[PDB]
Amino acid sequence: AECSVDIQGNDQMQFNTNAITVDKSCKQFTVNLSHPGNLPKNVMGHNWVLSTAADMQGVVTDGMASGLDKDYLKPDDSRVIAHTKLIGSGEKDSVTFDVSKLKEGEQYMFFCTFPGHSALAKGTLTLK
Amino acid sequence: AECSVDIQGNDQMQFNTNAITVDKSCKQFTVNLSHPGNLPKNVMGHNWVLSTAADMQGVVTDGMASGLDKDYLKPDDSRVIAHTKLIGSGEKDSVTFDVSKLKEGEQYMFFCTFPGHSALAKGTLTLK
Amino acid sequence: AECSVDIQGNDQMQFNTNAITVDKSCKQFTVNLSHPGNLPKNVMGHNWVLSTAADMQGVVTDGMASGLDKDYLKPDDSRVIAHTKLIGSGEKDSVTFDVSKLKEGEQYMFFCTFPGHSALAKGTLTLK
Amino acid sequence: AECSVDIQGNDQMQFNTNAITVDKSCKQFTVNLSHPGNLPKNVMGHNWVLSTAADMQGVVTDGMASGLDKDYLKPDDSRVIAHTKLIGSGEKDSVTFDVSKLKEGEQYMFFCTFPGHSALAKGTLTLK
Ligand SMILES: [Cu+2]
Ligand SMILES: [Cu+2]
Ligand SMILES: [Cu+2]
Ligand SMILES: [Cu+2]
């Protein structure tokens, strides 16, 4: 709703939304991430990473290899189209990206690369 | 925001929120349920049912035994503090209840009784 | 035992195993799927689909959108190495595939494509 | 078989079984829990906790509130029949409990109380 959306990751390992639609008339899109819980990020940390559906698995695996101090994301990973930092309850982070990076007819997924969170903390994103 | 909350159950079998806090000032609390996907009621129907944490297994068990035709809810189930109807994508329902029916100190859960849905589609609710 | 395995998917959305080793000496491999429970296909159907971990997410998304008549799988989805049928309480289905469809140094996943189940009904398959 | 069982919690948040049968003639029952993968206790610890299916939601909730130094278990929780302690990969722990604490007929669930894991790491236990 407009060119930005507010996403929350909570203490049950879930995102409040599992589907995002990005309007073609948006030059950029902004994702605002908050964490509505009471748990630290060493325990229940969440980021919002975006890649094609096909790349999801790879990013996730490489990322949990990198650890906390690297936000569970592989540095200079060319498959991550856009991402937030990893936060804990009470923290916030936003990222804006170019909608011209996405393309009509490809399937993208967004998820949390923190170990195992991606089973539930994921959702589709489409250019519409 | 105020004495009411908007909950949405989607196609990935989840609620947008897994924690609700009802303020003591509320005379009545309202829940507005929605189904943002595009899957039908028979495949992915969702309801919002409230019971003490203690009663959740029974309501959910007795409920899935009841069937689609009965919104998967034991008719006249006494353990059910409040509930909506089961809806499919595109539909809505609300339920309002007296806060006098809840008590401080007790633990309640809200959940969906459509077969298997309460594993992910559930949450806590407290009178604070 | 041999080049086959017997797997059950219950009314709680769980397969009875998380991992399947496929011995390199088998020419064909056969999975015999059963569904212990009282819930029907349309409500709790279970299939066993196999793909590389990388292709899984897309198989799932595309299958969700295919409908029951299609066993929630996309017709002629080239990413599906093999699959059973969607079966409900009390039914059985088997499938046999050539182990040459499999390469080692590839991670495989098995899962059910029925709406919302893939988060719980999944496991790994390794050509060992 | 007989009076013990060996279960594993992996790095995908899954137990290697979803059902356990406790022979009514065993006088004590021992559960051996190990943790295969590569991740640590704070990112993916697993404990083995047993309670009636009724009491499960409440033990799980009071548990995550208890913190990692309490193994995500409320102490002296009268609802916990038996439990191991939380362990990371590479670890192991056992618990032997008195089969006279169980009653045939009544349903039991075992599960991990680590934040958001019980949704995936859970199963039933029956006295036979
Ligand atoms: Cu996360
Ligand atoms: Cu539901
Ligand atoms: Cu299934
Ligand atoms: Cu665990």
From Swiss-Prot, chains A, B, C, D:
Subcellular location: Periplasm
Statement: the UniProt record of this protein carries the keyword Hydrolase: no
Known role: Transfers electrons from cytochrome c551 to cytochrome oxidase.
NCBIfam families: azurin (TIGR02695)
Disulfide bonds: C3-C26
Record GO terms (molecular function): copper ion binding; electron transfer activity; identical protein binding; transition metal ion binding; zinc ion binding
Name this protein carries in UniProt: Azurin
The encoding gene: azu
Listed InterPro entries: Azurin (IPR014068), BlueCu_1 (IPR000923), BlueCu_1_BS (IPR028871), Cu-binding_ET (IPR050845), Cupredoxin (IPR008972)
SUPFAM superfamilies: Cupredoxins
GO CC terms in record: periplasmic space; plasma membrane
Main location: periplasm
Amino-acid positions noted as binding Cu cation in the UniProt annotation, renumbered to this chain: H46, C112, H117, A121
This protein's UniProt keywords: Copper, Disulfide bond, Electron transport, Metal-binding, Periplasm, Signal, Transport
Keyword presence, Transport: yes
Domain of life: Bacteria
Plastocyanin-like domain sequence ranges: 1-128
